[PDB]
Design a protein around this ligand. Structure first.
Ligand SMILES: Cc1cc2nc3c(=O)[nH]c(=O)nc-3n(C[C@H](O)[C@H](O)[C@H](O)COP(=O)(O)OP(=O)(O)OC[C@H]3O[C@@H](n4cnc5c(N)ncnc54)[C@H](O)[C@@H]3O)c2cc1C
Ligand SMILES: CC(C)C(=O)C(=O)O
Ligand SMILES: [Mn+2]
Length: 455
């Protein structure tokens, strides 16, 4: 970047909020994935939406790529500056506004995390349910289309994003559903909000998200259930879903994952395990518990090991499964798969994935949101063993392709980033790809909005 351009950036956001220092750029050139760090040419922290617009306009008209950056917890290299450019760290815009408890809605800026929002909402009787394991920006969660353990009951970001404020690549300000609007449903025009959820910073910069809030559950009960086999745990999961038990959380861990979590946090039996949580009244909980225990017993599940103090450490361990897996081989990095299949095909593909991990030399732990037909294989890689990273690539792709063969998707929540671009082309085919590209081209004609990602 030229010095004239850097001074132009400083004129918008202020000297302290522009950095070309190598260390600062390197810290903003990677996320939590194994994708190689690719430092931006500068990092910029805009202080308000007017500054975001003016930084975007400056970059766009100068031919400088723009990389939106939230909390950097992505796992597909979304923030990697594969063509250099300006990294826009959005987290100094950190205010919660328009809290409408009577309407179950709130507006958050990119610096607001889920933990910050729910702390703000303590004693309101309301909460925000979508719970990635990481302390992630809620606008980043909108950008990636995130879900979490609670999604099986309370929905994904796509279900819970009501409106988005977006700075388009050339600086124009769009409110996808209209400025200040919030409602339960609409047929007015084309739904622009859903286009920008899961766009990963390639269609514009999300500067606020309007979120659906939910009432806190009347009562909660959590438990773990150990099984003799992966087959038994996943069969139980499918049968719980087909019996329409409204479980709040149903999380799978294989024996490797359970052992890793034990060592990193817990003392559960080392076995394929379900972490379960139920919401309702006492009578409603007792009914759900009886029907769920009946199904798990049919498949050899243990009596439920019951679990606020215990409950929080249970889900804290689950939320840290990524780091528990990494701790199995200190110094390694990791790649997560994220396929999601029709639920009736979930037993085949998890059992097959377990057998393929056993039969390979790779270290993999299995965990995830099986209530959605979704799961993660966390594959460890030595950053210096290029042959191991080739085998982890080949394994991840082969699993992705098996998911596509079963009518599923290559990613349930993490997104495409740099890692799944070929799988996406296979998933939606030539007309799907061209349509997606035409949408990208109308919003970002010069191709400067986070280039090299998704498409
Ligand atoms: C331990 C751990 C557990 C995780 N668990 C989950 C999980 O359960 N579910 C899940 O879905 N993900 C999970 N993730 C992945 C990650 O937390 C989510 O993808 C999260 O939504 C990323 O948000 P971020 O702001 O940190 O993203 P970043 O890494 O900052 O960015 C991600 C992508 O979105 C773009 N982007 C970010 N902010 C904006 C914005 N405001 N406007 C436009 N584009 C933007 C970036 O350019 C990039 O392409 C986990 C990650 C870790 C490390
Ligand atoms: C494995 C990580 C990336 C995750 O998404 C989760 O904890 O569910
Ligand atoms: Mn997940």
């Amino acid at each position: 970047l030229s010095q004239d351009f850097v001074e132009a950036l400083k004129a918008v956001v202020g000297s302290p909020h522009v950095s070309t220092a190598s260390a600062v750029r390197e810290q903003h050139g990677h996320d939590e994935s194994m994708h190689r760090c690719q430092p931006p040419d500068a990092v910029v922290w805009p202080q308000n939406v007017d500054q975001v617009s003016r930084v975007a306009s400056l970059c766009y008209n100068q031919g400088v790529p723009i990389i939106p950056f939230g909390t950097g917890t992505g796992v597909e290299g979304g923030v990697c500056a594969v063509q250099g450019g300006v990294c826009i760290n959005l987290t100094h815009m950190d205010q919660i506004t328009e809290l409408n408890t009577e309407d179950f809605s709130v507006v958050v800026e990119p610096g607001v995390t889920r933990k910050a929002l729910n702390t703000h909402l303590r004693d309101s009787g309301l909460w925000f349910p979508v719970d990635p394991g990481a302390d992630a920006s809620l606008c980043g969660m909108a950008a990636t289309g995130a879900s979490g353990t609670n999604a099986v009951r309370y929905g994904t970001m796509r279900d819970n994003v009501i409106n988005l404020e977006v700075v388009l690549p050339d600086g124009r300000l769009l409110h996808t559903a209209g400025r200040g609007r919030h409602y339960r449903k609409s047929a007015a025009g084309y739904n622009l909000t859903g286009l920008f959820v899961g766009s990963e910073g390639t269609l514009g910069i999300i500067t606020s998200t309007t979120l659906r809030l939910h009432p806190a559950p009347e009562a909660t009960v959590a438990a773990t259930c150990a099984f003799p086999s992966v087959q038994a745990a996943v069969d139980s999961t499918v049968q719980i879903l087909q019996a329409a038990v409204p479980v709040a959380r149903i999380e799978f861990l294989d024996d490797v994952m359970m052992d890793a979590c034990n060592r990193h946090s817990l003392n559960c039996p080392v076995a394929p395990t379900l972490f379960l949580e139920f919401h309702g009244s006492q009578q409603t909980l007792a009914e759900q518990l009886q029907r769920t225990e009946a199904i798990t017993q049919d498949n050899g599940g243990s009596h439920f090991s019951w679990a606020a103090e215990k409950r929080n450490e249970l889900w804290a361990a689950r939320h840290n499964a990524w780091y528990a897996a990494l701790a199995l081989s200190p110094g390694s990095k990791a790649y997560s798969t994220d396929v999601c299949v029709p639920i009736s095909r979930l037993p085949e593909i998890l059992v097959e994935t377990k057998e393929e991990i056993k039969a390979s030399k790779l270290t993999g732990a299995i965990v995830g949101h099986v209530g959605d037909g979704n799961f993660h294989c966390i594959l460890l890689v030595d950053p210096d063993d290029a042959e191991e990273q080739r085998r982890v690539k080949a394994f991840a792709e082969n699993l992705g392709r098996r998911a596509l063969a079963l009518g599923g998707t290559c990613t349930g929540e993490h997104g495409i980033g740099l890692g799944k671009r070929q799988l996406l082309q296979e998933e939606v085919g030539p007309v799907g790809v061209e349509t997606m590209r035409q949408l990208k081209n109308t919003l970002d004609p010069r191709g400067l909005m986070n280039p090299g990602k998704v498409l």
